[PDB]
Amino acid sequence: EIGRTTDPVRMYMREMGTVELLT
Amino acid sequence: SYTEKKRIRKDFGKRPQVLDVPYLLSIQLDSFQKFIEQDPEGQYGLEAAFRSVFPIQSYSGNSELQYVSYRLGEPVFDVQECQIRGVTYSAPLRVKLRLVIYEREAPEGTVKDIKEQEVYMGEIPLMTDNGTFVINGTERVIVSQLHRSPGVFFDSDKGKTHSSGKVLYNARIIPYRGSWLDFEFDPKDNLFVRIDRRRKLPATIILRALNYTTEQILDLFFEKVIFEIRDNKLQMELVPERLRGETASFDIEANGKVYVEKGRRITARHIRQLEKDDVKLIEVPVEYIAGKVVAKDYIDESTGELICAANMELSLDLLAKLSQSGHKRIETLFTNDLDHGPYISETLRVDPTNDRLSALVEIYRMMRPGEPPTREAAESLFENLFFSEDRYDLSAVGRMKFNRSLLREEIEGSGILSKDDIIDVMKKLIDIRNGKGEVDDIDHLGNRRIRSVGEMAENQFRVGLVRVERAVKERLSLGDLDTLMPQDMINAKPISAAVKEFFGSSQLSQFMDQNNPLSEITHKRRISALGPGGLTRERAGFEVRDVHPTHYGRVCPIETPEGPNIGLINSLSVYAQTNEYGFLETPYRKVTDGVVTDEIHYLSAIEEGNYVIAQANSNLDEEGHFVEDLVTCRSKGESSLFSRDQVDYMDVSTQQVVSVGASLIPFLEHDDANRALMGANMQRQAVPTLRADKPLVGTGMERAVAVDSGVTAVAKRGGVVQYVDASRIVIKVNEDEMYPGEAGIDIYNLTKYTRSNQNTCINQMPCVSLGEPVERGDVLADGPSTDLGELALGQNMRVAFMPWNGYNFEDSILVSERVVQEDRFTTIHIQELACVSRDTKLGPEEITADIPNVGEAALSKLDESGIVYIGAEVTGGDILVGKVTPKGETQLTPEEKLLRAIFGEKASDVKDSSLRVPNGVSGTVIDVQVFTRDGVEKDKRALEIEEMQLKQAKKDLSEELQILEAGLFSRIRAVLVAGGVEAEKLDKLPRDRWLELGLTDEEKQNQLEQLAEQYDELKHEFEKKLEAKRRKITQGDDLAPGVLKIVKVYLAVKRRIQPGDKMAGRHGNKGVISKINPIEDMPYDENGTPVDIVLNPLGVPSRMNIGQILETHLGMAAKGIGDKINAMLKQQQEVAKLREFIQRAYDLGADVRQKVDLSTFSDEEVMRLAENLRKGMPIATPVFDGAKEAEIKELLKLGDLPTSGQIRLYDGRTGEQFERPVTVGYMYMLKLNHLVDDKMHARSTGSYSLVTQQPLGGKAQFGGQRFGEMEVWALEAYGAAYTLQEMLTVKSDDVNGRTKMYKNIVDGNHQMEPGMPESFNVLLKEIRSLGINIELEDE
RNA sequence: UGGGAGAGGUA
């Protein structure tokens, strides 16, 4: 969820986990 | 005994000892034994740490690594070699592993490749024979730790919500490792949960995460009052034992009898009525259930809709719907106001989650917030938190305490938690909130276990093992299979790095105190509340720093530091042990039917809280029972009077409470505890002096401390002494203790003038003579501060208690000049200076006597090779070793070009950077050690040191071969006289040629030739030992990267006492020497003997240490007995007179337990005993078992001295007489290590700090005294504005001001011109570098 | 040279 974090690598992992993986 | 027949201490204790004082270093040695030892199944240490991680599968399962067995190789160096070379004393860890490959192309392809090679997993530092570790050449001690035990502890607070002043009960589950779990309460009576002290969730979230619905939660946490509705009037099956004192909501009814009326509260007589009628069903009005909460999920069975779920307050329309729906039997929960609280109901109402998945994503949202929670991620996190052994453990001590506190029965169990455990903790906390039960004692010694050195190093080994197990599992996942050895995938870096990090720089790996043997033994028996997992020093309250009543016999109450470390550092008592779980236990004698037996039970901290235990100061007779009826005891914390038959146990000794160092104080029971604490502290700071001197007043614990410290040399096998030296003792063993395959010759190499950690002197002086017979367990060499096997930290001083002209004003001490003449408190202080030759990138340095631009006077002390001679008395500002450094070319002038043309010194500008002795330091040179790296040819001086060490080692190996061939030729003589009878023909011929004699070929001839070739291979292994020793002392050292050679120089100073040196007795009477008075100025009695020390009498009746005065009187008596024995010996009376008088002095006490009888003593032993007693008879006095004043006065009457203790002294100077009698006797004074040679410092100008430009801090680097904030306030209160500006600017960080002040003072003009201090410009630049424009605004 | 930790101690 947007909001309750301050770890930058956790926010980056959350950002990269939305685009799907190619075949 | 043999070391005790030479001087016997008179014992004044009246009670027997049924249990001797144990080995004082069993805690450290036993903990490291359990770590390092090989056990099959009772998992301890390295085998447990190997089984905790092995085996390991792959990422798939196609291969795995099995552990077979481990072993430990021999150490490369002995302990003295590591202490010389500056390397740790360790051992190689060699462990057999098994690597199998699972053929995944097969269904179960078990055997494909079986590898079993020897793997080397780092190093572990071993513990020596005294309990210490040698880490990087220095000697350390791993202090034991006292942390909270794993388990559950139901504590509470004391009024933290001051809006009500309520109590808020809370549980806490502590694992050994893993996430903590804490249940608690609020002011609104709701159960909550914190995991790892994070944000509060409602406590049914963990229950719904445990796959429990609301219904099963209510069945687990409540009971059912059952309601049945019949013809639209309500009835309730009531158990009568649910109504206590509250009023009735209605006039209750039975079949035909009225019992409790409306508005009438129900009594216990009414409880007896409703149990004597045995009614079952009771009708009830409508409004009585308006307030109850339904506990059962109910659905309309006709249609299929939810009419009411669990935990909702039912209403009038809801009960009408329940009557009309067909569910004519409702189950509601039974609540109450007093005991059965509605806690779980209110938490289920507060509880926002509704099922397992929503509770799991709530737990995931709490634990790893700011992430998208998924089903399997939340599930795997919640499993790995508590219910997975690889990330959570209780280690069976937590399981023992868990089942103990939950009132269970089974001890062992699962290491992980479970659902029954969590609901049992919640049920117990709810019982505490009810009122049945009690909170735990948090500072108990049953809640605090001991985590010793073996357990701590086992845990650090496990941490390194998982840190390498992760990487080797990763490598086994993806690597090749046929050629994959275990060796190239096992890396010894993380395990060795973790265990070396722990042993070198943990918070519990302490540099050992080595002032006297008592210092080291008290360090090795120490208990620390701080460290990893324990407390912290700044945020500990008064409750952890107090003497809990369970410290009786386990932890000393009068030995601890007196600073900010006071309750947090403790000391183990004398008889204290540990469990197998780590709880402290102390021995007691079990009494049976009044008969106090000699059976010994070690009771732990909680077991003794049930029984009545007698005091050790209770009287016994005929090995029977108590002499009185109303006997004192202690039980359940408190201590009160009890009957003589009720008692369950007795203390094993009178010194069971106090520690080691607190049980060396004579007359401790007459001391105030604030001064006894300081005396026990200050005994550990006493430097060892030149000649050891036993206390005339002691305890008898001195021989135990001196033997058990390992600082002496005890005899391993008894026998007779063949050869004594200043540095060697050679003992011929008795043939009974001799083994049938040896010679029977033990060698003791005494360590001479070795430096201690506190720079004091350590040397072993031999206390035996030539041809003296010894036994197994007697002292052969007195250590640093021991005397004939008794601990001797100071000297016995003739002490007078009187004020002397203000020279003992406020804890000051006046000392005669005879104490300085006779060199009594003169100590030796050995100091090591080093010189490292490093590889500068401009050129390698060299150590040669060729030093530029210095005078040839200083070159006389050096040799021709550049090192100082052994024996040269150096002073401050002198040179010890000449090391020059290449400065650098950096210019091409014709002068240096002609220089490098004529000579070839191609770095003819060199900067002399020789090691010089620091200023104020003096003394001779007693030892020079030169280490070198490989490849570099060393020096002539290093060759000479090498040749000397080679000759010494060769002489030792030659004596070893001589005694071994002596034992082997004794064995061939034994088998020759067993075979035949040849006595004269073997000894008429020399012993070395005992091989060419022969006879007919038989079994004895075969044995003769086989022991011949055994002697040949003995010679073979002898020259192999020679070659190994030679290559070991000829191989270059494994020095640090960047150095070439290291020269270490050892100095030795003798420091006589002087004004300003600190001195103390044993009862917390410290003092500073103020003057050294001549013998013609000291006061004297009418025999003309002046007093050695004049103490102040006004220090006694405020501090209440009367053991000072009693030790003075008993020392006066003991010295009087020694004076009479010395008079008889000087007159050379007889042996009968000496035997009679010494016997009369020995059997003198009231009903004492010591029975010495000189009738068995032969006359040479009586003369030897009188010679050792001619300086005063030593007297034992156990703590809380002392000598009375009647026995002190009896000994004073024997010694022909005054009974009241006081003689008439005369003035030293005027010759007149002091108007009152003065207490004169013999106290035992110590010389503490706070010497004015180390405290005295002064500085006019020196170096400055780099950033702040202020003078340095420290005597080591010639610093300035810190004029702090409070002194700035004091000058501001005076008004000294110019003195304050002088302090702040020109004696400090103002550069132009301080240069101008120096040259103005030398110019004779005392005037300053001050400016801005450079720390203010540092401050301006730092506030500017914070992006904030600060500037001095000009006007 | 000279900085930072950790440990112990003195008043």
B309 close to B165: Cβ distance less than 8 angstroms: no
Residues 6+ apart with CB under 8 A from B1044: B837, B838, B839, B844, B845, B932, B933, B936
**Beta-strand (E) ranges in B1056-1139?**
1062-1064, 1070-1077, 1093-1095
Query: Could you tell me where in chain B the CATH 3.90.1110.10 domains are found?
Result: 150-222+341-441
B432 touches strand C (CB under 7 A): no
Chain A residues in contact with B374 by the CB 8 A cut-off are none
Quick count: other Cβ atoms within 10 Å of Cβ B1271? 13
Cα angle B979-B980-B984, degrees, rounded to a multiple of 5: 135
Contact state of A11 with B372 under an 8 Å Cβ cutoff: no
Helix (H) or strand (E) holding B524: helix B517-524
- With 0-12 / 13-18 / 19 or more C-beta atoms within 10 angstroms meaning exposed / middle / buried, residue B785 is buried
Q: How far apart are CA B706 and CA B744, in angstroms?
A: 27
Cα angle B321-B327-B328, degrees, rounded to a multiple of 5: 95
Residue B523 has which token pair? 């360090």
> Which chain B residue's Cα is nearest to A6?
B370
Please state whether beta strands B329-333 and B138-142 pair in parallel, antiparallel, or not at all (unpaired): unpaired
B531-CA/C4-C1' distance, Å: 20
Q: How far apart are CA B332 and CA B310, in angstroms?
A: 9
Contact state of A14 with B369 under an 8 Å Cβ cutoff: no
CA distance A22 to chain B (A): 21
B510-CA/C6-C1' distance, Å: 10
Q: How far apart are CA B369 and CA B556, in angstroms?
A: 48
Q: To one decimal place, what's the resolution in Å? A: 3.4
Question: Distances in Å between the alpha carbon of A19 and those of A15, A16, B371, B1010, B1120?
Answer: 8, 6, 15, 84, 99
Contact state of A4 with B370 under an 8 Å Cβ cutoff: yes
**Beta-strand (E) ranges in B736-819?**
745-749, 754-755, 761-762, 765-766, 773-774, 779-782, 786-787, 790-791, 795-801, 812-816
CATH 1.10.260.40 fits B573-653, yes or no: no
B569 touches strand C (CB under 7 A): yes
Helix (H) or strand (E) holding B233: strand B233-237
Contact state of A4 with B369 under an 8 Å Cβ cutoff: yes
Please state whether beta strands B224-230 and B329-333 pair in parallel, antiparallel, or not at all (unpaired): antiparallel
Is A13 within 8 Å of chain B by CB?
yes
| Sign of the four-CA dihedral B936, B942, B943, B949 | negative
Residue B455 has which token pair? 């357990």
CA distance A21 to chain B (A): 18
- With 0-12 / 13-18 / 19 or more C-beta atoms within 10 angstroms meaning exposed / middle / buried, residue B1273 is exposed
- 3 state SS of B738: coil
Q: How many residues are present in chain B?
A: 1339
Q: Would you tell me the crossing angle of helices B940-979 and B1003-1034 to the nearest 10 degrees? A: 170
Half-sphere exposure of B574 (CA within 13 A, CB side): 22
Q: How far apart are CA B366 and CA B813, in angstroms?
A: 67
Q: How many helices (H) and strands (E) does chain A have?
A: 1, 0
Question: Distances in Å between the alpha carbon of B1219 and those of B1116, B1171, B1202, B1213?
Answer: 21, 38, 17, 15
Distance of alpha carbon B727 from its chain centroid, rounded?
32
Q: How far apart are CA B880 and CA B877, in angstroms?
A: 10
Q: How far apart are CA B1071 and CA B799, in angstroms?
A: 13
Residues 6+ apart with CB under 8 A from B343: B189, B190, B191, B430, B433
- 3 state SS of B829: strand
Q: How far apart are CA B917 and CA B931, in angstroms?
A: 20
> Which chain B residue's Cα is nearest to A18?
B372
Question: Distances in Å between the alpha carbon of B920 and those of B682, B923, B1263?
Answer: 27, 10, 15
Quick count: other Cβ atoms within 10 Å of Cβ B1335? 8
Residue B236 has which token pair? 């309730």
Distance of alpha carbon B1156 from its chain centroid, rounded?
39
Q: How far apart are CA B592 and CA B597, in angstroms?
A: 7
Residue B827 has which token pair? 């100590």
Q: How far apart are CA B328 and CA B344, in angstroms?
A: 26
> B695: closest CA among B6, B10, B24, B5?
B10
- With 0-12 / 13-18 / 19 or more C-beta atoms within 10 angstroms meaning exposed / middle / buried, residue A8 is exposed
Where does B326-452 have alpha helices with state H? 343-350, 356-367, 375-386, 397-405, 419-434
Chain A residues in contact with B371 by the CB 8 A cut-off are 1, 5, 10, 13-14
Residue-wise DSSP of B95-129: EEEEEEE-BTTSSSB--S--B--EEEEEEEEPB-T
Q: Which CATH superfamily is domain B826-936+1037-1055 in?
A: RNA polymerase II, Rpb2 subunit, wall domain (2.40.50.150)
Is A8 within 8 Å of chain B by CB?
no
Query: Could you tell me where in chain B the CATH 6.10.140.1670 domains are found?
Result: 937-1036
Strand-pairing partners, residue B820, are none
Distance of alpha carbon A2 from its chain centroid, rounded?
10
Residue B421 has which token pair? 């455990």
Contact state of B371 with A4 under an 8 Å Cβ cutoff: no
In this structure, which CATH number among 1.10.357.10, 3.90.1110.10, 1.10.579.10, 1.20.120.790 belongs to the domain B150-222+341-441?
3.90.1110.10
Is A17 within 8 Å of chain B by CB?
yes
Distance of alpha carbon B459 from its chain centroid, rounded?
17
Which residues 1051-1110 in chain B have a CB closer than 7 A to strand C? Answer: 1070
Residues 6+ apart with CB under 8 A from B1270: none
- 3 state SS of B546: coil
Query: Could you tell me where in chain B the CATH 2.40.50.100 domains are found?
Result: 711-785
Q: How far apart are CA B1111 and CA B1107, in angstroms?
A: 6
Question: Distances in Å between the alpha carbon of B59 and those of B380, B466, B710?
Answer: 17, 16, 53
Question: Distances in Å between the alpha carbon of B860 and those of B563, B642, B874, B940?
Answer: 50, 82, 11, 18
> B517: closest CA among B824, B830, B767, B782?
B782
Q: Which residue approaches C5 most closely, CA to C1'?
A: B505
Q: What is the CA radius of gyration of chain B?
A: 41
Quick count: other Cβ atoms within 10 Å of Cβ B837? 22
Nucleotide nearest to B506 (CA to C1'): C6
B1199-CA/C7-C1' distance, Å: 50
Residue B1080 has which token pair? 């013609």
Quick count: other Cβ atoms within 10 Å of Cβ B1043? 16
* B549 cis-preceded (ω within 30 degrees of 0): no
Contact state of A5 with B372 under an 8 Å Cβ cutoff: no
Chain B residues in contact with A12 by the CB 8 A cut-off are none
B565 touches strand C (CB under 7 A): yes
Strand-pairing partners, residue B103, are B109
B755-CA/C4-C1' distance, Å: 29
Q: Which residue approaches C7 most closely, CA to C1'?
A: B510
In this structure, which CATH number among 3.20.20.150, 1.10.260.40, 3.40.109.10, 6.10.140.1670 belongs to the domain B937-1036?
6.10.140.1670
Distance of alpha carbon B464 from its chain centroid, rounded?
24
Residue B341 has which token pair? 């609280």
Q: How many helices (H) and strands (E) does chain B have?
A: 32, 60
Cα angle B1234-B1240-B1246, degrees, rounded to a multiple of 5: 135
Contact state of B369 with A17 under an 8 Å Cβ cutoff: no
CA distance A13 to chain B (A): 9
B674 touches strand C (CB under 7 A): no
> B1158: closest CA among B1174, B1172, B1173, B1142?
B1142
Q: How far apart are CA B395 and CA B580, in angstroms?
A: 12
Chain B residues in contact with A15 by the CB 8 A cut-off are none
Task: Give the residue carrying structure tokens 């019949």.
Answer: B230
Chain A residues in contact with B370 by the CB 8 A cut-off are 1, 3-7, 10-11, 14
- 3 state SS of B41: coil
CA torsion B931→B936→B942→B945, rounded to 10°? 70
Residues 6+ apart with CB under 8 A from B112: B100, B101, B102, B103
Q: How many residues are present in chain A?
A: 23
> B1156: closest CA among B9, B3, B134?
B9
> B1024: closest CA among B1090, B957, B1091?
B957
Bases on strand C under 7 Å from any protein CB: 1-3, 6-11
Q: How far apart are CA B865 and CA B943, in angstroms?
A: 11
Residue B498 has which token pair? 């973790």
Chain B residues in contact with A14 by the CB 8 A cut-off are 370-372
CATH 2.40.50.100 fits B711-785, yes or no: yes
> Could you give the maximum distance between any two Cα atoms of chain A, in Å?
33
**Beta-strand (E) ranges in B1100-1148?**
none
Chain B residues in contact with A9 by the CB 8 A cut-off are none
B1129 close to B1174: Cβ distance less than 8 angstroms: yes
B681 touches strand C (CB under 7 A): yes
Task: Give the residue carrying structure tokens 């040629």.
Answer: B993
- With 0-12 / 13-18 / 19 or more C-beta atoms within 10 angstroms meaning exposed / middle / buried, residue B1279 is exposed
Using the CB atoms, write b or e for B719-758: b if 16+ within 10 Å. Answer: bebeebeeeebebbbbeeebeeeebbbbebebeeebbbbb
Query: Could you tell me where in chain B the CATH 2.40.50.150 domains are found?
Result: 826-936+1037-1055
Q: How far apart are CA B245 and CA B190, in angstroms?
A: 26
CATH 2.40.270.10 fits B654-710+786-825+1056-1239, yes or no: yes
Instruction: Give the technique used to solve this structure.
Output: cryo-EM
CA torsion B925→B931→B936→B940, rounded to 10°? 30
Helix (H) or strand (E) holding B1050: strand B1043-1055
B369 close to B385: Cβ distance less than 8 angstroms: no
Encoded amino acid at B45, one letter: G
Q: How far apart are CA B417 and CA B177, in angstroms?
A: 12
Which 8-state DSSP code applies to residue B917? P
Q: How far apart are CA B932 and CA B1296, in angstroms?
A: 47
B683 close to B515: Cβ distance less than 8 angstroms: no
Residue B475 has which token pair? 């490598």
Distance of alpha carbon B363 from its chain centroid, rounded?
41
- 3 state SS of B131: coil
Which 8-state DSSP code applies to residue B1335? -
B749-CA/C2-C1' distance, Å: 43
- Of A5, A13, A17, Cβ closest to residue B369: A5
* A-B contacts (CB, under 8 Å): 22
Strand-pairing partners, residue B918, are none
Query: Could you tell me where in chain B the CATH 2.40.270.10 domains are found?
Result: 654-710+786-825+1056-1239
